[PDB]
């Protein structure tokens, strides 16, 4: 709120693989605090949902 970036949907629904091992991402890779390289953007999984 009250900062004004034109935020929204950043990447669309699409499926792509990890560049190092050339294998598609699975549930095992998505662990909290891991680093995932989606295309060129690297993300660190800070917190997860209770579900």
């Amino acid at each position: 709120k009250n900062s004004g970036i034109w935020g929204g949907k950043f990447l669309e629904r699409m499926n792509h693989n990890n560049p190092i091992n050339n294998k598609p991402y699975t549930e095992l890779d998505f662990q909290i605090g891991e680093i995932i390289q989606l295309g060129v953007y690297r993300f660190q999984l800070l917190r997860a949902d209770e579900y």
Binding site: K1, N2, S3, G4, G7
Partner: protein, 430 residues
């Protein structure tokens, strides 16, 4: 040398000052207890422009805060940087004016002005060599619109040759925060035209449109408004405080801007401004800066500059840039907009350069433009004022304090004459 003192009045004036001193203290690196902690050597060379020295090495602003109710000052003191202000410099009333120009210019302010004029005489006298005075006030509130203009009158009657600069907030009919705005607005402008060496107008509606459209921020606040005004104010006098290629102070702008003595009502603009999501997308270059100066939406006044013709323009740049790029861009714009520039005045753009940009910025610009387009707001306020006055609305609240309708008639006549004279040059040809 050539320092200036600060005088502010009214709630809007005090709110403007609270952020103006905030931004100037940030620029000069002064902590809220008043002790220097800056990095550069230049930051202390020209301190005496706005600050006085005290024992123990502290700095005190040379500003005087006036208002007819104590609540506004009691609130502004408690905020950040509120302890800098000298406690003796607060001047105030115990009752207030209640948006009544008659009360704020005839009955109560006349009695109160003794102390404030004494202290302003003291502060002006103590300075080494005076340059001029700046005032910040709103034309929508009675106490401000009366006390400020009456103080302007008396201070002019004491300092005929020094320069006076007035930052006037005029009420647009869209955001009409008071139903009696036309009366005191016209009464204020009638006295202001005869005395103010310079007046620059600011519109809350235009500020709101700019904040919503350019910054793309959802819900603006009066803090953001005061921040815009503070940046614009600092841009004008940065030259007076810092070295540059072409230093150009208030007297320079005054002599170089006004073709005729009674046309001293300007509208201003600032650049650059963008959201952080586009802050890295943009490329900070002189063509971008000039595009943003002369864009219509950048002006913080409701007047549309394309509905009239500029008498003159002035731009002050901050940062390091070449004189060639500035001059060539100015010439290119003056040639591409030949229609909107009055023909009988050759080369009607002034340029100035300062090597020290605002903190965090690589380049910046403050723009002051004098054009015939501001007649629209005068015509609108005149229409609203005559709509009120033909039926004698609200009139007894003003006439009960020794003021009569002859003054109203004279003020309306003078403002109408100003509008007609101001459009006279619009169609003048050589």
């Amino acid at each position: 040398m050539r320092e200036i003192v600060h005088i502010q009045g009214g709630q809007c004036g005090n709110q403007i000052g609270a952020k103006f001193w905030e931004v100037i203290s940030d620029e000069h690196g002064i902590d809220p207890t008043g002790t220097y902690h800056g990095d550069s050597d230049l930051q202390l060379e020209r301190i005496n422009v706005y600050y006085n020295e005290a024992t123990g090495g502290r700095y005190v602003p040379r500003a005087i805060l006036m208002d007819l109710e104590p609540g506004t000052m009691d609130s502004v003191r408690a905020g950040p940087f509120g302890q800098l202000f000298r406690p003796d410099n607060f001047v105030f009333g115990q009752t207030g004016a209640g948006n009544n120009w008659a009360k704020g210019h005839y009955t109560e302010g006349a009695e109160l002005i003794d102390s404030v004029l004494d202290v302003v005489r003291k502060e002006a006298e103590g300075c080494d060599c005076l340059q001029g005075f700046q005032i910040t006030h709103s034309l929508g509130g009675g106490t401000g619109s009366g006390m400020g203009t009456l103080l302007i009158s008396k201070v002019r009657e004491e300092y005929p040759d020094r320069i006076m600069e007035t930052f006037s907030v005029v009420p647009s009919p869209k955001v009409s925060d008071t139903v009696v705005e036309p009366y005191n607005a016209t009464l204020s402008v009638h006295q202001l035209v005869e005395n103010a060496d310079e007046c620059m107008v600011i519109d809350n509606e235009a500020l709101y449109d700019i904040c919503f459209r350019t910054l793309k921020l959802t819900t603006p606040t009066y803090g953001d408004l005061n921040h815009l005004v503070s940046a614009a104010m600092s841009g004008v006098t940065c030259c007076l405080r810092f070295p540059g290629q072409l230093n150009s102070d208030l007297r320079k702008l005054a002599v170089n801007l006004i073709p005729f003595p009674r046309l001293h009502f300007f509208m201003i603009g600032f650049a650059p401004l963008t959201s952080r999501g586009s802050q890295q997308y943009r490329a900070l270059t002189v063509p971008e800066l000039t595009q943003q100066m002369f864009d219509a939406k950048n002006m913080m006044c409701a007047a549309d500059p394309r509905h009239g013709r500029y008498l003159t323009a002035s731009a002050l740049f901050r940062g390091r840039m070449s004189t060639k790029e500035v001059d060539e861009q100015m010439l290119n714009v003056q040639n591409k907009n030949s229609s909107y520039f009055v023909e009988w005045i050759p080369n009607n753009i002034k340029s100035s350069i300062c090597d020290i940009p605002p903190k965090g910025l690589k380049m910046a610009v403050t723009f002051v433009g004098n054009s015939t387009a501001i007649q629209e707001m005068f015509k609108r306020v005149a229409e609203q004022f005559t709509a009120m006055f033909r039926r004698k609305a609200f009139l007894h609240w003003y006439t009960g304090e020794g003021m009569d309708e002859m003054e109203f008639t004279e003020a309306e006549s003078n403002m109408n004459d100003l509008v007609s004279e101001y459009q006279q040059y619009q169609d003048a040809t050589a």
